[PDB]
């Protein structure tokens, strides 16, 4: 069931690595511009004044953020990101949170890591948002498994990969990191276009599960 990472091709490699290293981290802008009828429009904000287009699944998604003052953190590009302007316009998919909903203590989450079955080092993130999208922790984590077990270099020996996000009640999300949607991430990021975001204090701790080069 696990995707290998032989699967993927160079481009949707170095996109993966890309913005898993270079996350779009931005607090407290607000947008009272909606595009399409599911976009919100950050004129310029985006990197080097480029704007910023954040993308979401539904307008029922962009009209609650509207005009609010909003925190940003999500996977970031170029390729395929409508322009609003003649300016190069950056996206984004979801990872949009209230700027007023932070937490009373930043809540740090433990990592369980397995390569082949051995146990790692257990790993951390932390956020300090009431409401977290999964496409931040997400994010937060695949950065250290970029870092410590360079899942995302084509030549490291890690080949099938599994994050569990798991919550203090059965519930459990979990991201294939070989399983992208294509090599582009106007693609692969879709996984995040839901703006699914989670209670932080209901999360309990996650899985991580990489498996070596077979
Ligand atoms: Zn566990």
């Given at each position: 069931?696990?995707?290998?990472?032989?699967?993927?091709?160079?481009?949707?490699?170095?996109?993966?690595?890309?913005?898993?290293?270079?996350?779009?981290?931005?607090?407290?802008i607000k947008s009272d511009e909606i595009?399409?009828?599911?976009?919100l429009i950050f004129?310029?904000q985006?990197?080097?004044?480029?704007?910023?287009?954040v993308?979401?699944?539904?307008?029922?998604?962009?009209?609650?953020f509207k005009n609010?003052?909003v925190?940003?953190?999500?996977?970031?590009?170029?390729?395929?990101?409508?322009?609003?302007?003649?300016?190069?316009?950056?996206?984004?998919?979801?990872?949009?949170?209230?700027?007023?909903?932070?937490?009373?203590?930043?809540?740090?989450?433990?990592?369980?890591?397995?390569?082949?079955?051995?146990?790692?080092?257990?790993?951390?993130?932390?956020?300090?948002?009431?409401?977290?999208?999964?496409?931040?922790?997400?994010?937060?984590?695949?950065?250290?498994?970029?870092?410590?077990?360079?899942?995302?270099?084509?030549?490291?020996?890690?080949?099938?990969?599994?994050?569990?996000?798991?919550?203090?009640?059965?519930?459990?999300?979990?991201?294939?990191?070989?399983?992208?949607?294509?090599?582009?991430?106007?693609?692969?990021?879709?996984?995040?276009?839901?703006?699914?975001?989670?209670?932080?204090?209901?999360?309990?701790?996650?899985?991580?599960?990489?498996?070596?080069?077979?």
């Amino acid at each position: 069931d696990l995707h290998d990472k032989s699967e993927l091709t160079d481009l949707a490699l170095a996109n993966a690595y890309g913005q898993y290293n270079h996350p779009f981290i931005k607090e407290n802008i607000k947008s009272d511009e909606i595009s399409g009828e599911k976009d919100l429009i950050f004129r310029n904000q985006g990197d080097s004044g480029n704007d910023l287009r954040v993308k979401f699944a539904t307008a029922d998604l962009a009209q609650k953020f509207k005009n609010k003052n909003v925190d940003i953190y999500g996977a970031s590009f170029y390729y395929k990101c409508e322009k609003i302007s003649e300016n190069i316009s950056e996206c984004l998919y979801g990872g949009t949170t209230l700027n007023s909903e932070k937490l009373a203590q930043e809540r740090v989450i433990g990592a369980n890591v397995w390569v082949d079955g051995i146990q790692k080092e257990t790993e951390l993130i932390r956020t300090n948002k009431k409401n977290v999208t999964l496409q931040e922790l997400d994010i937060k984590i695949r950065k250290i498994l970029s870092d410590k077990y360079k899942i995302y270099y084509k030549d490291s020996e890690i080949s099938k990969g599994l994050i569990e996000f798991d919550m203090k009640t059965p519930r459990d999300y979990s991201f294939d990191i070989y399983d992208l949607g294509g090599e582009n991430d106007y693609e692969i990021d879709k996984i995040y276009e839901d703006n699914k975001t989670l209670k932080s204090d209901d999360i309990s701790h996650i899985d991580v599960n990489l498996y070596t080069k077979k």
